[PDB]
Amino acid sequence: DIFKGLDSLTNVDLRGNSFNCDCKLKWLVEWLGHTNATVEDIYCEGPPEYKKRKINSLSSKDFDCIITEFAKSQDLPYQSLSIDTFSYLNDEYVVIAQPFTGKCIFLEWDHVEKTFRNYDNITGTSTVVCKPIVIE
């Protein structure tokens, strides 16, 4: 939406440029569907599916960027062989076991920093799996 912050527009030129029509240009589609100035025809000198193709007929949501990409949100430092979840006190606690340290680490959803901090370190030696069950 780079043309935002402008008013009383009559015409624009967009010639001699090889715009690659993609998500960055999606709003242009919307803009070309919304603005009613005297701007001449504009072409997608871009993706092979749109060879010099007009944006007026071309749509934006056809190549919309779906928001589902696994973002790296945290990096704990300790080895992790088996992970689990369980709703205790309506809190979805997580038990990331550890095979090498020989310790059954607990984690909880911290509501203040939006993080995961230590909750309990169950002892043992060379564990494999810590399956938590909630009976009554």
Binding site: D7, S8, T10, N36
Partner: protein, 482 residues
């Protein structure tokens, strides 16, 4: 003085649907287009006239034309003005029509001469054209409305001419190549009009504009506590008063005559001396930076003991009528011609305009019939001659008269309405009639047959302006003060 003061003409633009369709039916484009035209005309007027044209409002008809639209500039102008009278009510010094219907005449725009600050005359019509073209047309029409017109007698005599001899001047027929300079007779007519009292409503600063709050635009608008303009020109005027649209420590003003050296001036100071007897001197309120609102003698007040009457702040005599119609050297003739020509005669003395059977004028009063002056020149300053100028000759007097016309149906050749014939005896429909014909209102008076309790003069707003050391509204109580 009053001429050097910054005039503020509150203009409102009426727009028809022809140019709305020509502008691709866009409201915002038309709005910004009108703003640009107003700014361009203000830039024209700022160089010499020192007058800012404030676009107070504007109306554009996205639907269609309300009234009949004709190629005749006069008929279309009459229709626009009557529509303004019927519907338009907001206060505006000028009401100008951008005519989408391009007039089929030779003149660019049709505006009344000296008609500003009037309900039925304050504005004109400007036809469709290019941005610069209709900007020039609006400038010419607003010059017309303020009495600034090209002087035909001086054009013929060469007394004053266009200093932009390259492409002519603005007042003439609009050439493609626009000039940049007005003639000196334009400014001289401006001083003559302002000194006569006309254009008294151009001395108010609007608080609301079509422009968003802009720092340094020369007007203290909404959201701006003070405004001295751009700091480039703020040094000369209001340097310590307002800075960057903000006050400088302890301050009370930004500009204005009633506030010298950024501080309040003493009470009783005259921020505007009266131009003539029809004007009333204005004194600052003591806490307002801007000068007092323009107040003139109410319509019907005489310029002198008997002769002359102030209408709209402008003096009117038979001599003044001859001066405006014919010229300064032309003066009104004596009662001899009035009683020896208006009683009986064709083309020489006539009450009403009837070519076939001229209207007879009685001997009771002959001062509203044919306007008779002395030493009428070859051509009048403005108007046209319906045929030839009438000339008629113990005392011998050079007796003359005419049928000077105008862009309106009213004939300037006869005596204008309201010219005195005697005690409370003034022209109405080419006849001497009393005040009861005009139904002039009575100001705030307490005694019988007096104005403002005798001592004091009522202003144009039908409100008493009592004399010195008289604070009462109706001039009844004396309050000494220092």
């Amino acid at each position: 003085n009053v001429e050097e003061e910054t005039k503020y003409i509150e203009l409102m633009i009426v727009n028809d649907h022809l140019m709305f369709k020509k502008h691709r039916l866009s409201v915002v484009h038309t709005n910004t287009y009108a703003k640009s035209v107003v700014n361009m005309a203000d830039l024209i007027y700022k160089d010499q006239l020192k007058t800012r044209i404030v676009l107070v409002a504007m109306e554009t008809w996205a639907t269609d034309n309300k009234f009949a639209i004709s190629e005749n500039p006069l008929i279309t102008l009459r229709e626009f003005m009557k529509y303004r009278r019927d519907f338009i009510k907001e206060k505006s010094d000028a009401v100008h029509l951008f005519s989408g219907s391009q007039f089929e005449s030779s003149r660019s725009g049709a505006a009344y001469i000296g008609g500003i600050c009037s309900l039925l005359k304050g504005g004109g019509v400007n036809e469709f054209g290019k941005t610069d073209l209709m900007a020039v047309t609006l400038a010419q029409s607003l010059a017309h409305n303020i009495g600034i017109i090209s002087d035909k007698r001086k054009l013929a005599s060469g007394e004053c001419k266009c200093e932009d001899t390259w492409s002519g001047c603005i007042m003439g027929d609009t050439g493609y190549y626009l000039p940049k300079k007005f003639t000196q007779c334009n400014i001289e007519e401006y001083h003559d009009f302002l000194n006569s009292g006309g254009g008294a409503c151009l001395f108010n600063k609007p608080s609301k504009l079509l422009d968003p709050p802009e720092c340094g635009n020369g007007f203290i608008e909404t959201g701006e506590e003070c405004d001295c303009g751009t700091p480039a020109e703020c040094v000369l005027e209001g340097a310590e008063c307002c800075k960057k649209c903000t006050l400088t420590q302890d301050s009370q003003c930004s500009d204005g005559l009633c506030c010298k050296k950024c501080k309040f001036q003493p009470m009783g100071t005259v921020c505007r001396e009266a131009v003539n007897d029809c004007d009333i001197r204005e004194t600052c309120s003591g806490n307002s930076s801007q000068c007092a609102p323009n107040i003139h003698k109410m319509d019907g007040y005489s310029c002198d003991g008997v002769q002359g009457i102030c209408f709209g702040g402008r003096c009117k005599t038979r001599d003044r009528q001859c001066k405006y119609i014919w010229g300064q050297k032309v003066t009104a003739s004596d009662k001899y011609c009035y009683e020896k020509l208006n009683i009986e005669g064709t083309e020489k003395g006539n009450c009403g305009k009837d070519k076939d059977t001229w209207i007879q004028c009685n001997k009771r009063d002959v001062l509203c019939g044919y306007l008779l002056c002395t030493n009428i020149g070859n051509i009048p300053r403005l108007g046209e001659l319906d045929g030839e100028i009438t000339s008629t000759l113990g005392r011998t007097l050079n007796c003359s008269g005419g049928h000077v016309k105008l862009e309106e149906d009213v004939d300037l050749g006869y005596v204008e309405d309201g010219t005195p014939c005697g005690p409370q005896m003034m022209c109405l429909e080419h006849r001497c009639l009393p005040v009861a014909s005009f139904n002039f209102s009575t100001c705030l008076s307490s005694k019988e047959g007096t104005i403002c309790s005798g001592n004091g003069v009522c202003s144009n707003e039908l409100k008493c302006v009592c004399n010195r050391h008289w604070i009462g509204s109706d001039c009844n109580t004396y309050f000494p003060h220092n």
